[PDB]
Each structure stands twice: as structure tokens, then as C-alpha cells.
Amino acid sequence: PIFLNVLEAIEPGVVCAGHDNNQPDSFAALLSSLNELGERQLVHVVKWAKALPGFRNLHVDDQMAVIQYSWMGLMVFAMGWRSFTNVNSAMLYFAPDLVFNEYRMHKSRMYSQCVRMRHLSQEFGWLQITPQEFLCMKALLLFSIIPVDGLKNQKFFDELRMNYIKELDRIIASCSRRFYQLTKLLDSVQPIARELHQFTFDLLIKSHMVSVDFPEMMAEIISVQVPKILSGKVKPIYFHT
């Protein structure tokens, strides 16, 4: 199975946030650390995406665009899995040095979103999602959000997306109940990503007022790309309507 071999081989390692776990949980410190984690993770997502099968079929402008729209969903899905595997979905395992208990959920001012991410994480346990199903789904999430007006070379994207879907159905193989449930789970990422998009955008707008630090690449992406999503110019591809 050349496909699974490559997915397994490219899967990123452990990324730490550099959070100071000796200081008191404050909003400013937690969110600044989540932003720095987002930045560190983005480096890894770019290297990962560019090593995926087919990914270079895309126009270079589409490659960047698809990353810049999909990172939130990709990260959130990966964090849900780590949470499941490491702490049985009891807490959110953003990183080894940044694990959210309920207290940090509350202090983060993102409690409802954290709760939703926690539900997502319990879904990996409740559905008995296998590591290989996880890997295939995560790869598909890269090809699940695009401009309503299409991409520069949209045909290559449609063919890529078709192939990733085929690969998932294949690792699945009333067996169609399975595909129903995996597709529903993938869809469930998107509303979570949308609320995080709204949260992080509002946080960027008010970042000086609340003393939260955004790194460079996070600030650019959230001011240039994320509003295209929130304004409806760029929209998730749902399986179910």
C-alpha cells in the first residue's frame, strides 16, 4: 500500500508551544502560547502538505491557498486525535507543554469552542477510529475548503480530492455505515473551525487591548485569508448538507 506508507512516513512529530507552566493561567499568556504553537505547527503543516501524494499536481498558488484556508481544521483534527490517544479525551492536548484542563478552558475565554473540540476528540473513541482512518481523513481535510469562485487550476484539485476520497473508502474496505460516519465526523470539524476562525479574528483585532501576541505569519494569515472564509468567499466542502 504505497499510499498509507507515505501518509505514515510524513506524519509530523511532537511540537511544543514553549508555554511557561509555572506562571498563573491568564488569558493573555495562554492565548499568546496557543498563537506561538499555531505558528510552529504551520511550519510543520506546510512541509507535510507539500510531501503528500499528488500535491504538486496543484498550481503553486493553489498549494499555498489550500494550506492557508485549511490549517485550522487540520490542526484541530490532529489535536483531537492527540487528546484521544494521550489523555483519553479528558483534556485538550494542544502540546506536551500545553494541556488544557477545564480551568484553562475557562480562562482561555474559548470554553464553548474547547468543549466542542473535546466532543470531537471523544468521537475518535466512540467511533473506534483507527490510526490509518485518522491519517486518511486528516489528508482529506487539506482538500476540504476552497474559494466559492474556484481555484486557479481547479481541475487538478477536483481530481486530487476524488483520489483522497477513494483512498479512504478503500481503507474502509454496512461498511457504507462506516463511510457515512467518517464523512459526518469530517463535516463536524468545519463548524468548530469556523468558530475558532471568528474567535481568532476578533482576538487579532483586539490584540493590543488584551496584550495577546500574534506571530508574523499568524497575523498575516488571519488578516488576509481568514476573513475570506468568514465573509463567505471561501467555504468548506461538506459531504452532507
Partner: peptide, 8 residues
């Protein structure tokens, strides 16, 4: 572009 710098 910050992210384009990183992309390439």
C-alpha cells in the same frame, strides 16, 4: 508575504 516566505 510572511507565509509565502515560509512556503518557499
Amino acid at each position: 508575504g510572511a507565509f509565502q516566505n515560509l512556503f518557499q
